[model samples]
Target: VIKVSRRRWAVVLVFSCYSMCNSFQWIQYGSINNIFMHFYGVSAFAIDWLSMCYMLTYIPLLLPVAWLLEKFGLRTIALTGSALNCLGAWVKLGSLKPHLFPVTVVGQLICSVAQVFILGMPSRIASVWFGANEVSTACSVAVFGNQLGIAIGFLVPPVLVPNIEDRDELAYHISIMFYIIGGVATLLLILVIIVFKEKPKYPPSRAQSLSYALTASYLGSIARLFKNLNFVLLVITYGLNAGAFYALSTLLNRMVIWHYPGEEVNAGRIGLTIVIAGMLGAVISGIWLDRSKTYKETTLVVYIMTLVGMVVYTFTLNLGHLWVVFITAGTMGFFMTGYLPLGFEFAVELTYPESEGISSGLLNISAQVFGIIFTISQGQIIDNYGTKPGNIFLCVFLTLGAALTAFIKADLRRQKANKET
Candidate 1:
């Protein structure tokens, strides 16, 4: 029997910090999407691009980033990813005058680039530094940092730059927000360089060397995944769920303002509840699944909750009470965000012996592809028909996802591995 080192915790911790900082920046512009759209004199679609760019950029670089992970050591990815993030943070300073939105886009694009560089590493980091039993746990903790960053990102912008008619004054407040994130990113860079290592001095468990047996042609992997019908079912269900989550978030400011009218700060506060609620639900979910091994059932339950939460949020949003919206948003956050890990974990169970990063990676690509469609389409529906119809559109798709999920009668091949022979 091999014993894993205690230092594995340290190795994963700083990477979490890296993910937190990068992801926080990713949502910062979009969280206050309307604010930037008018202030920058740009279209809402352009502002959405600020957020969507991360998703868009993620697609092309995936293969290269995957190859790079194999080509380089953990330290190199950590170092360069953090360095770019830090630089990207400061780069936003060039755009304080407002029409400089493109300059900020340039900065955001750089940060998005930084994300793909480090984004694929969570799986590698987990199984690299952690023992098999605890590998998923380590990954969950690292992933937690990301959700934490996003929760804070949703809350920070509205408070920092509240609604003011004066463009210059508004611009001044935005500078403070930029400076704060820039400083945090810089501090995180220092920590990553100081604390992160390539890995433990040796392997953590037998699981560490398992990926060497794979790596078929990149497109070939796609064909194999397509051949698996159960994974296909999970993919559609997962995409609709993932897309709705992004679509809701991208349009959250609009949703709150439509009924509440200029309550952007409260909107931000509500968005925070969504992610924090999910964080709690997410942590408990992994624990439950680890003990129960009922992956399919848990996913269905989570998806159903997400649907119910959206329905309640749709009608109750205009009830003229922030408190109710807060509660409903939390409900949506709980299951939707909680389901994130479930998708990745179940993907592993369905596609065992095929690395974690690729399957989940494909899931994310579907998420972005679907996320872009849902976000843009939902935005249009809200514009033409109002937030209710837009939300209904999402609910319709989620209904299909839930139905598809019920049909995912896949075997837990990974779970069966231990009992085999």
Candidate 2:
């Protein structure tokens, strides 16, 4: 077994904390969409834009962010990500006025741009800091930090703003929420500046050797990535999975709000359940992937499980039973969210010797593209049709993702040996 250093874990911890802040910024709106709608008197479409802004900016900026990672290395890029997150959270505070929803969206846009840097770091951080045997697990932990923040984002808002009818009260509570998020993010940003390093003293894995290379053609990287069949399939499968989660996350309150009116707390609780369950699943699956080195099998199993969960969740959400919604939503979150980091690890294995930042950034690009599409489309569906039909749309895409996951082929041990030789 290769020895790992405390500094390596520290790097993951600091950056992952910033990841939590990034997640917290976007998800905060979804957790309290009803309050936002009433406070601003905006439609779901406008509210959806607040969340979609995260994806909208991420897609266009990811390639440039990857270029920065390649040029400046992780420390500079990660510090920048954290700084932006903190800045965005504070900027959001300026929009506490009920009519300043556009200002809030602009602030969220800044955080969304920051998300581009952090989202692609997990696989790269794992490859640089951990031995091959532990890379998958490390990646999972990094991602778990982000998911945990989302869980809290889902849990906090309902308690914070249980009622939005009082404009003065709503403004007061929203300002307090911004202050809390901004303060936590600033603390994390300072820690990252002091703690994060560019890379380990020695190459932690063979992938680390490729990460530092300066010879890659920036424009040609996307072309080369598409040439690999396994990477392409992983992109599609992972993108669809991510898109589904994004859609669900942005519209989850809208999904159940009609059934249980004025119960924002219940919606937040269910959202929390979904993310917490996924966090547990992510850790378990990460351990399994490290031990078995069965990226394909583990991913496919979870994909199928998530597909089943979504099917059950879609049909039963309107049954008006809180317990049933909890069970189904939790099930969906467990498998769908768990599978997220698996995609990062799989992408790295499939594209060994390629920069994990670029490869994973490309993977994230797919996710953002699909995320924007689903978020916008689902909003339209909810407006034109109803929540049930909107949910069925999610199930259809998830089914497509599962079918793609079945065919992705990657062997960690064999790939490592090939690269080493």
Candidate 3:
């Protein structure tokens, strides 16, 4: 059995906290969009930039981040990411004053850029820091931190800044939130700088035990990834599932707000339920993948469940039944969020010689492309055609994703080897 060390756990913890902190603000605005709209005086389309920006910035930056991870390793990239995350939170404070809404956008953009550095780390970190026995679980936990932060993002804001009518009071509470998040991020950055190492003293897996010098240039890596049919299919399916998840997260408040009208807390609860379920699902699926090594099977099962959950949620969210809404929402989150790490690990498996960061970067590129498309197009549907039509639009894409997932085939060599042992 491979030995797990305290250092490994510490690295995961610091990175997980980093993931959580980065997500805090991105999800906050969407969770409380009703209040945000009133306070900032922006349309749904405009408010979406706060969350959509996370996806937007990734499209262009992920390739560079992948190259950085390849050339500079983890600590440098993570430190830079943490610094920007903290700075963005502090910058957002400038928007608290009336008529300074533009400042918040700038701050969010900074955080969104910070997000690029960290988004591709989960699989790479798992390979570099944890044993094969632990990689999938570690990746899941890392992702769980992000989902947990998003859950808190969904849970906290409405509680802190519920639909208050007074503009000054609304601004006051929102600013306090910015201060709290900035403080947390700053502290976390200090911890990462003090504690995070470039890599484990001993490599964790056979893949890492071997020297990992870059064999190809950045563009060459991209070209090689594209040539792998399994990798390509994984990217498309993963992107579609992830895109739907992002779209739902961006628009969830609006979907339920009409039913709950003035009850931003209810919308927050639904958002919380979805992410919490997703976190749990991610952990459970990670453990299962570690044991079964059935990445393709696990992915397909989760994708199918996610599609079903979306159908239930899209139809039930506006029905005025809180319990039904919560259950369906949670179901959707469990499957969608659960699939995140599966997609990452599977991509790494399909493209073994390619660096994990590069494969994950490619996956994220598709995710962002679809996320932007869904957010803008679906936002229009919500604004013009109503929530049901918008949801139907999401379902169509999800169905396509499920179909695409069915076609993917991978070697699963490790799973076979482990079974023999």
TM-score for all predictions? 0.88, 0.89, 0.91
Better candidate by lDDT, 1 or 3: 3
Badly placed stretches (over 4 Å) of model 3 are 1-3, 37-44, 162-172, 211-215, 258-264, 314-321, 382-386, 413-421
lDDT of 1 by residue, 333-403 (tens): 88887887778777877877665667777777778889989988998899999988999999999999988
Best model per TM-score: 3
Q: Once all C-alphas are superposed, what RMSD does model 1 give against the true structure?
A: 3.0
> What is the Å distance of residue 295 in model 1 from its true position?
2.0
Judge candidate 3 at residue 180 and give its lDDT.
88
Ranking by lDDT: 3, 2, 1
lDDT of 3 at 414: 41
Better of 2 and 3 by lDDT: 3
Between prediction 1 and prediction 2, the one with superior TM-score is 2
The CA lDDT of each predicted structure is: 0.79, 0.81, 0.83
Rank by TM-score (best first): 3, 2, 1
Q: Candidate 3, 380: how far from true, in Å?
A: 3.4
Query: Model 2, range 178-256, lDDT digits (tens) per residue?
Result: 8899999999988987878887777675545444452457777778889988889889888888888877876787788
